[PDB]
Chains A and B, each alone.
Chain A
């Protein structure tokens, strides 16, 4: 179909695996891979508690988290020597920035 459409699917499939095949058993200790997604959670918790630091810091934390993870994953896609980023379609990134 459309390469851009295909790459939106790949991103979704990567992100699901980070809380399924990384979040293994829902341990109260936390899986070795899942320690990363604890750290991301906490360093952005403490960052937007720093930056905005209201009672609405956590209220705008999901948006600030999916803007993190989107860019974090799409520069794994950009490391693939034949798969080309969604972010490399600049029109999506710039449009998103103006919208926000």
Chain B
């Protein structure tokens, strides 16, 4: 009798399935990426990247670096008032 049946030859399931494209993508995309990723810039070494570390971090939305940076410009024209007068 008939021993002809679906199971003996299978090769349509092993390409036809949709997650294969995603699978082979993410073995290439992921295998070496960091499991988190590192923190917003904090030191580039110039002796002012340390200034960034305390105030002007990406996680800081606090008004402190703004105040500090603003205050520098106040010091410039105020002295120059006394340099011109």
Give residues in A with beta carbon < 8 Å to B: 10, 17, 20-25, 27-28, 31-34, 77, 80-84
Contacts and interface: CB of A to CB of B under 8 A. Distances in A.
B6 interface: no
A82 B78 contact: yes
B33 to A, nearest CB: 11
Interface residues of B, number: 23
19 contacts: A10-B73, A21-B56, A21-B65, A23-B41, A24-B40, A24-B41, A24-B58, A28-B37, A31-B58, A31-B59, A32-B61, A33-B61, A34-B58, A80-B73, A81-B74, A82-B78, A83-B73, A83-B76, A84-B77
Contacts of A84: 77
Interface in B17-53: 37-42, 52
Task: Give the dominant DSSP class at A's interface.
Answer: loop
B58 A27 contact: yes
Given A21-B52, A24-B40, A27-B40, A32 B58 contact: yes
A82 B40 CA distance: 33
B73 A32 contact: no
Contacts of A33: 56, 58, 60-61
Given A21-B41, A25-B39, A25-B40, A82 B58 contact: no
B70 interface: yes
Nearest to B58: A31
Contacts of B78: 82
Nearest to A79: B70
